[PDB]
Symmetry: C3
Subunit: 40 residues, 3 copies
């Protein structure tokens, strides 16, 4: 079932975003692969 995200962080060394979830014992995360780049 859907649960809120407590915070989003991204890492430009590992190219992953991590969502810390409000669920259960508090130690669950969602993680996915991302492009990370500088824009103009």
């Amino acid at each position: 079932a859907p649960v809120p995200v407590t915070k989003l962080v991204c890492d430009g060394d590992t190219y992953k975003c991590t969502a810390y979830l409000d669920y259960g014992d508090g130690k669950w995360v969602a993680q996915w692969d991302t492009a990370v780049f500088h824009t103009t």
Copy 2:
């Protein structure tokens, strides 16, 4: 065109995040595949 996300939720049964969007009639969502796991 990029539109704000009003709400982000993640679901460890379907392994999807859903972003609720601020656009038009208010019923648009984004959805992507994610890993969901416990940490120590």
Copy 3:
């Protein structure tokens, strides 16, 4: 290093979600492919 997401926007022409990152000059983003659709 993990850095916080300032804000999240999604685009239903490019089918990309963009996370604006709190880092350096403020022009860094994380981007990933997404479904975008209308709900009922």
